[PDB]
Structure 1
Amino acid sequence: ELPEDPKWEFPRDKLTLGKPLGEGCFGQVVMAEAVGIDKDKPKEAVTVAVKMLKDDATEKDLSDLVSEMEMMKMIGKHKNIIDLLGACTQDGPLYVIVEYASKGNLREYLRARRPPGMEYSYDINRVPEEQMTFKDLVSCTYQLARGMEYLASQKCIHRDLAARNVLVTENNVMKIADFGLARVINNIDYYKKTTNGRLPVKWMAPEALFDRVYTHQSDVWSFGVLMWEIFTLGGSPYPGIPVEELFKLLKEGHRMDKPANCTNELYMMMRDCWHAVPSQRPTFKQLVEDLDRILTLT
């Protein structure tokens, strides 16, 4: 049922599955070893992650996994985007092989690096994580701005940018992931007559929610929310406000208060990202240039 792609195909006999890696954010993912996947070291057994259907998989799960694979194929390689390494598409279950990120998603990464006593704080391995500096959070912000700048230039809309959908490698490299709702658009806005509301409310631009249209400027809105998450060390956006009441509040013009780890300059960048009129928000290219300069002064 799956056409062969010889340039991406990876032999099953070379891939050994290990332990499950969590589930919830990126579907069913497992650790694995793949001999000769890494062309740089084509004899070495490299650690990877494999996404695969569960026993309780639906028909849509299959098509979604295929679509994420092809989306990954067409997006291309970038330092701040999770890389497609290969795939197993014939004679057996569908395996999509991706870059391994040892430190998990950004949310949990930040939450483990929160001060003892704060909500959600926890010591991984029962050992305390070295504290997030200001430079670290801005570097995290910059890397993600770079990733989205690349995505935007590949004429692609993520539509679910959050810290839960960002992966973090051993060397603390940010890697945008979860292309479940990602689409390849043109210059005009993404609109469909048949509405589905599969987008998380608290990360959605108003035009996404009210007009059911999506642009690169909507992903900017979500980046503003991602900034807020970063600088609150994985805090829940619109704290104390249920999703149900946020429909009303966005129309009234509600925005989130300034994180205390954040500078005025950066919160302004946040507030610009949260402009009601999409073309009044900065572009990712602009966001990169600013974050460059700020990071340089640290």
Structure 2
Amino acid sequence: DLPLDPLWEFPRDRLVLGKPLGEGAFGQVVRAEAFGMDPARPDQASTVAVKMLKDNASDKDLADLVSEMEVMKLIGRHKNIINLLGVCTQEGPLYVILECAAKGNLREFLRARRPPGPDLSPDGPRSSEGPLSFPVLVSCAYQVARGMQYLESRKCIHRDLAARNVLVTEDNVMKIADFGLARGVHHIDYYKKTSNGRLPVKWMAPEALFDEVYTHQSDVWSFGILLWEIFTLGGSPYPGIPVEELFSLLREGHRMDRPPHCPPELYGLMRECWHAAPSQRPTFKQLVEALDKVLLAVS
């Protein structure tokens, strides 16, 4: 096999694999029960997410998974990222064991929590009150900014930051996922639509799309798209615009409109994140500060 790294190796027989969660370009993720993830409580159960190779896996798929494992080892721990818990490399298939986020991704979290429509009959004293409030939406944005600030401090560029790549825990903690990934940036099919209808090109900064240049400031552009997703309660960006039209609109400097029920403070931050010049966009540290000021004011 690969060499044994005792810092991270976890006995595979302490895992009970459960129902799949999803599949990526290289790898599939399944939920699992782990026993004794904390060695001081060797019989204690926890729920984890296990990434492994697909059945049709190539050598490149394996190298990609090994690279992701090594990034996750070096990233260190932060509240607002999916953290590595362990690996299984010996005497069996390669597993990368990560935190599981029980509420799924932020896009599905928001879409399932949109406020009741005008067609519902009032029933009780809170018929108009949906699950989502403005301070909680701001906190979601602030937590993503804090996770990105951490990743940036560890020299990690995400390259596809989007609400679907932010996961939500049982306690509504945002955790950035899939930050350590080979994404085939020199062979992106810009017209590709996912099985859920997503066009990932809509999150790419112009220097990434047109020039294949990625920096932390290209992640800031994507964060602005993510902010728009938050304040549309999981809307899809550039509504109605196919990829061919997107290319021409971006060349003309088009930006998304201010969404309904979005204060100008938040649309202002979106527009700063989409400034054409990467040096004219805020840094993640500045976004953390700006969002914290709003969060404190409204809390």
TM-score, normalised via structure 2 length? 0.88
Structure 1 residues 78-117: Cα deviation after superposition (integer angstroms, max 9, x where no partner): 0000010001011111111000111011111111001345
- Cross-structure match for 2:5: 5
Mapped partners of 1:136, 1:26: distance in 2: 34
- Cross-structure match for 1:250: 250
Mapped partners of 2:264, 2:100: distance in 1: 35
SS state at 1:256 partner: coil
Deviation at 1:57, TM superposition (A): 2.3
Mapped partners of 1:161, 1:211: distance in 2: 18
Opposite residue 161 of structure 2, the aligned amino acid is L
Q: Does 1:154 align with 2:157?
A: no
Deviation at 1:49, TM superposition (A): 1.0
- Cross-structure match for 1:284: 284
Mapped partners of 1:169, 1:250: distance in 2: 35
- Cross-structure match for 1:212: 212
Q: Does 1:197 align with 2:181?
A: no
Evaluate the alpha carbon distance shift between residue 96 and residue 181 of structure 1 in structure 2; reply closer, same or farther with a 3 A threshold. closer
SS state at 1:214 partner: coil
- Cross-structure match for 2:99: 99
Structure 1 residues 116-141: Cα deviation after superposition (integer angstroms, max 9, x where no partner): 459xxxxxxxxxx9511001110000
Instruction: Tell me, yes or no, if the aligned pair for 1:160 and 1:181 is still in contact at 8 Å.
Output: no
Structure 1 residues 24-67: Cα deviation after superposition (integer angstroms, max 9, x where no partner): 59941111111111356443111111111121223322111111
Instruction: Tell me, yes or no, if the aligned pair for 1:8 and 1:87 is still in contact at 8 Å.
Output: yes
- Cross-structure match for 1:83: 83
Instruction: Tell me, yes or no, if the aligned pair for 1:75 and 1:151 is still in contact at 8 Å.
Output: yes
SS state at 1:21 partner: strand
- Cross-structure match for 2:108: 108
Deviation at 1:240, TM superposition (A): 0.2
Mapped partners of 1:62, 1:3: distance in 2: 15
Opposite residue 132 of structure 1, the aligned amino acid is L
Structure 1 residues 155-175: Cα deviation after superposition (integer angstroms, max 9, x where no partner): 111101011111111000000
Q: Bigger CA drift: 17-26 or 269-278?
A: 17-26
Equivalent pairs counted in the alignment come to: 279
Mapped partners of 1:198, 1:150: distance in 2: 30
- Percent identity at matched positions? 75
- Cross-structure match for 2:139: 139
Opposite residue 239 of structure 2, the aligned amino acid is P
Opposite residue 132 of structure 2, the aligned amino acid is M
Q: Does 1:32 align with 2:32?
A: yes
Mapped partners of 1:165, 1:182: distance in 2: 15
CA RMSD after TM alignment: 2.2
Structure 1 residues 214-250: Cα deviation after superposition (integer angstroms, max 9, x where no partner): 1111000000000011111111100000122111111
Q: Which runs of 5+ in 1 are unaligned?
A: 119-128, 184-191
Q: Which runs of 5+ in 2 are unaligned?
A: 119-128, 191-199
Opposite residue 163 of structure 1, the aligned amino acid is A
- Cross-structure match for 1:261: 261
Instruction: Tell me, yes or no, if the aligned pair for 1:156 and 1:182 is still in contact at 8 Å.
Output: no
- Cross-structure match for 2:70: 70
Mapped partners of 1:246, 1:90: distance in 2: 47
Deviation at 1:196, TM superposition (A): 2.8
Opposite residue 60 of structure 1, the aligned amino acid is K
